[PDB]
Design a protein around this ligand. Structure first.
Ligand code: MG
Ligand code: MG
Ligand code: MG
Ligand code: MG
Ligand code: MG
Ligand code: MG
Ligand code: MG
Ligand code: MG
Ligand code: MG
Ligand code: MG
Ligand code: MG
Ligand code: MG
Ligand code: MG
Ligand code: MG
Ligand code: MG
Ligand code: MG
Ligand code: MG
Ligand code: MG
Ligand code: MG
Ligand code: MG
Ligand code: MG
Ligand code: MG
Ligand code: MG
Ligand code: MG
Ligand code: MG
Ligand code: MG
Ligand code: MG
Ligand code: MG
Ligand code: MG
Ligand code: MG
Ligand code: MG
Ligand code: MG
Ligand code: MG
Ligand code: MG
Ligand code: MG
Ligand code: MG
Ligand code: MG
Ligand code: MG
Ligand code: MG
Ligand code: MG
Ligand code: MG
Ligand code: MG
Ligand code: MG
Ligand code: MG
Ligand code: MG
Ligand code: MG
Ligand code: MG
Ligand code: MG
Ligand code: MG
Ligand code: MG
Ligand code: MG
Ligand code: MG
Ligand code: MG
Ligand code: MG
Ligand code: MG
Ligand code: MG
Ligand code: MG
Ligand code: MG
Ligand code: MG
Ligand code: MG
Ligand code: MG
Ligand code: MG
Ligand code: MG
Ligand code: MG
Ligand code: MG
Ligand code: MG
Ligand code: MG
Ligand code: MG
Ligand code: MG
Ligand code: MG
Ligand code: MG
Ligand code: MG
Ligand code: MG
Ligand code: MG
Ligand code: MG
Ligand code: MG
Ligand code: MG
Ligand code: MG
Ligand code: MG
Ligand code: MG
Ligand code: MG
Ligand code: MG
Ligand code: MG
Ligand code: MG
Ligand code: ZN
Lengths: 96, 48, 62, 71
RNA sequence: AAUAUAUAGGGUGCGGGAGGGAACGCGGGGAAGUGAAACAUCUCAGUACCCGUAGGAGGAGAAAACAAUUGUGAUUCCGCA
RNA sequence: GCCGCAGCGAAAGCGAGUCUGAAUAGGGCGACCCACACGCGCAUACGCGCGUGUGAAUAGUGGCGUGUUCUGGACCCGAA
RNA sequence: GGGAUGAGCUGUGGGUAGGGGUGAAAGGCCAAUCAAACUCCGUGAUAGCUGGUUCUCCCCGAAAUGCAUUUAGGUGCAGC
RNA sequence: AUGCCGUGGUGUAAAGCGUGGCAGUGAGACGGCGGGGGAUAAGCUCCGUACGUCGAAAGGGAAACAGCCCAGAUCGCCGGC
RNA sequence: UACUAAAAACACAGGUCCGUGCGAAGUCGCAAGACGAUGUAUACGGACUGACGCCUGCCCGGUGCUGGAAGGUUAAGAGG
RNA sequence: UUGCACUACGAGUAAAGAUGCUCGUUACGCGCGGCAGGACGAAAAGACCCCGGGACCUUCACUACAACUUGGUAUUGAUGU
RNA sequence: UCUGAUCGUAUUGGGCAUCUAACCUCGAACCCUGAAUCGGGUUUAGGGACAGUGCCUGGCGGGUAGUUUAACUGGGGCGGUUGCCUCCUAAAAUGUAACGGAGGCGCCCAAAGGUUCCCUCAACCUGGACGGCAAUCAGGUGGCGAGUGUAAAUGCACAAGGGAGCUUGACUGCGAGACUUACAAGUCAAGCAGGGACGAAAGUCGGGAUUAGUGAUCCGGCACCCCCGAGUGGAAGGGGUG
């Protein structure tokens, strides 16, 4: 920068640490579930990866964005708060 | 001659404020009734 | 040869969910007795990098 | 000799008839070269900001030059 | 032998070594210019060079290993990470 | 394997939200179509939210060119 | 012009080697080079400095200012 | 007096603004007007100026004569003002 | 001072001071080893002055060198 | 040595000292021997000065290292006070 | 019984002395050796747990080595200067250079801050013990010529100037919208909430009439929150807020 303190040196470092032990979930929404399984039925992680809604070999978490109307039987990890309510209102079940 | 002093809540001992005073004009520790965010009310404070 | 990113730049900048680059603000590490709460609150938080610096910080990050 | 301080960019920022938003700075000044009128607050360093939206209006108030904002 | 036990040394007879070779290996020693817009930490670089010693390759190799509540099962090299 | 597929937060975490905060306060970042009809609380009208069409607009990634850039001698020549 | 039996001159053979030698001392001499020889290698050393950079036409067309700078004949951002 | 900010009309293609790609420049010179330094000297020096020209502008005038006056070369013509 | 300086520069006999008791001090070497010297304080090394004559005054505050160890400060180790 | 060439002078102008530009003046073409006023003549990318880099030298500049030196401990034992 | 001083065993440490066997001797003799001032071995004469050497450690150390040693500047050097605040230059918005013309700052105040209430100064005239040009008093006149913590400028008499009562807002969580600006910075801010001060209320209060009194990032320290915790539970260490 010509000799003045550069932008990458006169600014403070971003605060905090990064968790070495953090677990990451691949997410899918009930709107996507409703779009992909109009007939309802069982909805497993293998079904999700086959339909391409989620990456393979990863932990799956279900979130609650969208409208769900089909009666489905979703098995996953770590359901959301809204996802459980929407699934049970639709009439299915959410096992872990 | 005018050092920086810090005031701690009497009850919870939290170091809440830092300020200045003249050590000669005020050779003794200050008492002020400041607001304590921990206790949530106004409490007495004193130097450390 | 694989391109290397800048260590200090990657420690001082980061991107958001739409690609904005954000930073913290200076003057907030010490000598805080004479700084009023208005000034300290102004210096608190994160801000988007200025439009006249975005090109160079992007080049540093990539 | 040889020293000087920085130019402080004082002066009137919004002239008569301009439509301002609440919080606009109207006059940077030392002391009350202008005084605040209706819907105008002064500010810590004599800044004469706006308290309401409206149009800037200058006037005389028995010796004092004042700045007001008409709703 | 000195000197006694003896040993150092000496005689004889059998084997072997030495030196060279373009690259590649392993072990050891180890710069500066240069970059840091100066410079000493740092870099360059364990690079150049030097020393010892190979083989058709070498080195490594058979858990006093990883992993983490499941498990894998000597080493080497390639691609990811 | 990589990139796209959800973000927010120092992080635990939560997630169309999340962080700060006593706050159902305000802000930061991130999501979220109406030129329109149907029913709906709705205005003279303009529409506010919900399900569909009246049919409403997205998008990424791999290859090959070109410009710039990075690491390499790096456009060429030149010291003491 | 100076010395010319002397601290003389000279032949042959030999020895001291580079941050080292040798020097009745001038930083002198060490192969026509010496305030650190020469050759090869690191090596295509580096140079904010000087020079050079090769065919054509069409359209547009500057700057020599501000801020900062171990900065002032360099560079970064703005302005154009 | 000028200049500056806002606003309503009228006019004007190659204005303006946002966001990206690629720049060059960051030694200026003289002239007009207003000033500082200088001796109210300099082809001196340092600023201001929706001032000009040169730089990067050929043609005509000023004998010659970057920076003054007139005037901005798309090519041709043995036409005119 | 080969190759622009021959001098008032260097050397010199003479002087003084400091070191060295002997594979000495000093120097070349990581070391062994070597020179010093096949020498032994009337000897060897270093420093300054520079035949000869007459002389060489005052200051030990500063910095060196030589000697001392009452007191102050101070490493590793011991202690825990 | 060499960008050229059928390479005058005066007073001017101009990167402010003109063979080459202006206005004048002078001068038949080409050789040979001489002189040294100019061609900012030739030769050497100015040694002076400044800026950047280097080299070597100094010291109560900084940081290191050899050498010299202190103590502890290993080599390293015995008996007395 | 500090038991200060003292007893006998331990144990080991510290000097001090002696010894010899490690180790040392460029003292001597002999042998390998036929030729040897090398070397090695044997014996003897001495020294001796010292010295020397290894590892650790302090000093000293231009003897050697790598380097640094600012810029501006009417050439360079010497002199002066370098950040911030105020004025003039500055051409009636803002901005504007020179080694142009003048000054200040690197603090102070626990009240010199907040709030409620009250007051008007300097100078001049007249009278009055010490007392005078000028101390205190009285009466006139006096609209700002005084004062403002501290430079200057802009302000302030409606007072921001003088006096008094009570107090700690010299708060915590925020902050629409702006000024200035290459960037980094810098500056103002109505209003919302908590919990307060003063006030009968209306209301004011996030330091000081305003503008100087200051220093980025890195790397560390301290207090608090209990965020991560390298198999698990802890801890170390890190993180966050001040
Ligand atoms: Mg007091
Ligand atoms: Mg902190
Ligand atoms: Mg604070
Ligand atoms: Mg000013
Ligand atoms: Mg025998
Ligand atoms: Mg061989
Ligand atoms: Mg180096
Ligand atoms: Mg460098
Ligand atoms: Mg460089
Ligand atoms: Mg073989
Ligand atoms: Mg093998
Ligand atoms: Mg994240
Ligand atoms: Mg929100
Ligand atoms: Mg495509
Ligand atoms: Mg020879
Ligand atoms: Mg000399
Ligand atoms: Mg020679
Ligand atoms: Mg050399
Ligand atoms: Mg050298
Ligand atoms: Mg190299
Ligand atoms: Mg054009
Ligand atoms: Mg600097
Ligand atoms: Mg552009
Ligand atoms: Mg420049
Ligand atoms: Mg310039
Ligand atoms: Mg003028
Ligand atoms: Mg003038
Ligand atoms: Mg000029
Ligand atoms: Mg000039
Ligand atoms: Mg001008
Ligand atoms: Mg040019
Ligand atoms: Mg022209
Ligand atoms: Mg033009
Ligand atoms: Mg012309
Ligand atoms: Mg044209
Ligand atoms: Mg000579
Ligand atoms: Mg002579
Ligand atoms: Mg001569
Ligand atoms: Mg001489
Ligand atoms: Mg010796
Ligand atoms: Mg003597
Ligand atoms: Mg002497
Ligand atoms: Mg002499
Ligand atoms: Mg002598
Ligand atoms: Mg003499
Ligand atoms: Mg004397
Ligand atoms: Mg003395
Ligand atoms: Mg002395
Ligand atoms: Mg003495
Ligand atoms: Mg001494
Ligand atoms: Mg002339
Ligand atoms: Mg002429
Ligand atoms: Mg002529
Ligand atoms: Mg001609
Ligand atoms: Mg001739
Ligand atoms: Mg001539
Ligand atoms: Mg001649
Ligand atoms: Mg010449
Ligand atoms: Mg030159
Ligand atoms: Mg010189
Ligand atoms: Mg010993
Ligand atoms: Mg020892
Ligand atoms: Mg030294
Ligand atoms: Mg040196
Ligand atoms: Mg170097
Ligand atoms: Mg300079
Ligand atoms: Mg000068
Ligand atoms: Mg001005
Ligand atoms: Mg102005
Ligand atoms: Mg003006
Ligand atoms: Mg001053
Ligand atoms: Mg006050
Ligand atoms: Mg007051
Ligand atoms: Mg009060
Ligand atoms: Mg405070
Ligand atoms: Mg804001
Ligand atoms: Mg309240
Ligand atoms: Mg407020
Ligand atoms: Mg303030
Ligand atoms: Mg003040
Ligand atoms: Mg740093
Ligand atoms: Mg653990
Ligand atoms: Mg901890
Ligand atoms: Mg906070
Ligand atoms: Zn408390």
């Amino acid at each position: 920068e010509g000799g003045q303190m550069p932008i990458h040196m006169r600014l403070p470092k971003l605060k905090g640490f990064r968790n070495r032990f953090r677990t990451e979930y691949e997410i899918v929404n009930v709107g996507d579930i409703n779009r992909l399984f109009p007939q309802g039925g069982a909805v497993g992680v293998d079904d999700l990866v086959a339909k391409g809604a989620v990456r393979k070999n990863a932990l799956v978490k279900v979130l609650g964005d969208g409208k769900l109307t089909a009666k489905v039987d979703v098995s996953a990890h770590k359901f959301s708060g809204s996802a459980r309510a929407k699934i049970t209102a639709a009439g299915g079940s959410a096992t872990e | 001659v005018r050092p920086k002093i810090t005031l701690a809540c009497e009850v919870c001992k939290h170091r809440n404020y830092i300020t200045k005073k003249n050590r000669r004009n005020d050779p003794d520790r200050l008492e002020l009734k400041k607001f304590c965010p921990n206790c949530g009310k106004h409490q007495a404070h004193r130097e450390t | 040869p694989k391109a290397k990113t800048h260590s200090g730049a990657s420690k001082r900048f980061r991107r958001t969910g739409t690609g904005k680059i954000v930073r913290q603000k200076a003057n907030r590490r010490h000598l805080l007795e004479h700084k009023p709460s208005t000034r300290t609150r102004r210096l608190d938080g994160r801000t988007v990098v200025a439009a006249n610096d975005t090109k160079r910080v992007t080049s540093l990050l990539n | 000799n040889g020293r000087d301080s920085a130019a402080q960019r004082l002066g009137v920022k919004r002239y008569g008839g301009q439509v301002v938003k609440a919080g606009e700075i109207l006059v940077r000044q030392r002391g009350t070269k202008f005084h605040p009128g209706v819907n105008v607050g002064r500010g810590g360093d004599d800044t004469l900001f706006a308290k309401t939206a409206g149009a800037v209006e200058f006037g005389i108030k028995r010796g004092r030059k004042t700045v007001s904002i008409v709703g």
